[PDB]
């Protein structure tokens, strides 16, 4: 049934969990007690832009990802239509959250227009670029800038173009 907290996410049973812990010895990330853990996830999605086309269908992405991460046990913060500077500020605030200390992991989701250089902010134009680089995301969440997530999986998901190319070449059979 999809009426529970895990929704449409298929459950790992007790037998499945123990098989996972038996197939691999000490090579799995530890999970904290479900009753006391405070998992956090962040979604930054840019739909309405100043100079570039509207990302129609982004609300579907927001809904799907928010519900999925909740299903997986994460409390989801959703932030919309931000400049690269706003994204940096938001990422810095996220790294400072007290909940990470009593969490075992985190998910960061970024969804926007994209170019070769990185992820576009709301004010982006070819003349005056507004770009958040992937390198900055890592830097802001590393052991130095986010000590609370030391030794804990940090999953970064990015929906965006990485250039203008179709990503294909022709071949004959």
């Amino acid at each position: 049934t999809s009426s529970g907290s895990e929704g449409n996410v298929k459950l790992c049973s007790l037998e499945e969990a123990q098989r996972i812990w038996k197939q691999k010895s000490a090579e799995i990330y530890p999970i904290m007690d479900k009753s006391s853990r405070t998992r956090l996830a962040l979604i930054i999605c840019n739909e309405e832009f100043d100079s570039i086309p509207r990302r129609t269908g982004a609300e579907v992405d927001i809904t799907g990802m928010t519900m999925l991460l909740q299903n997986l046990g994460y409390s989801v913060d959703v932030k919309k239509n931000l400049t690269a500077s706003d994204m940096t500020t938001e990422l810095e605030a996220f790294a400072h959250r007290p909940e990470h200390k009593t969490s075992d992991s985190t998910f960061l989701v970024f969804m926007s227009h994209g170019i070769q250089e990185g992820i576009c902010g709301k004010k982006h134009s070819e003349q005056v670029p507004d770009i958040l680089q992937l390198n900055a995301i890592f830097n802001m969440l590393n052991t130095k800038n986010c000590p609370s997530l030391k030794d804990k999986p940090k999953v970064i998901i990015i929906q965006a173009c990485r250039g203008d190319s179709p990503g294909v070449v022709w071949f004959k059979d």
Partner: protein
């Protein structure tokens, strides 16, 4: 006392396409990478670690159509398998 720790560890990034290349988004159905990721996470979170799930997502894109893309795992410093254990 003080101890040393790696500055960067336990990261995994998953991008919607390869460098230089476009990623696709349907106006009503949403982003294809996002939709595909959710489907795979719903199905495989119970049995597969995140690296395995992302690989399965990549495989689902293998046959290119008119709107082709190849999601890419980047900058991986996961030292262990990350299982979500949904329900736990």
């Amino acid at each position: 006392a003080i101890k040393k720790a790696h500055i960067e560890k336990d990261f995994i990034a998953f991008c919607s396409s390869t460098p230089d290349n476009v990623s696709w988004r349907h106006p009503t159905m949403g982003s294809v990478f996002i939709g595909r990721l959710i489907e795979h996470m719903q199905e495989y979170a119970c049995s597969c670690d995140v690296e395995e799930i992302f690989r399965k997502v990549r495989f689902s894109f293998e046959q290119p159509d008119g709107r082709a893309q190849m999601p890419t795992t980047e900058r991986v410093t996961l030292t262990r398998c990350f299982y979500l254990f949904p329900g736990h």
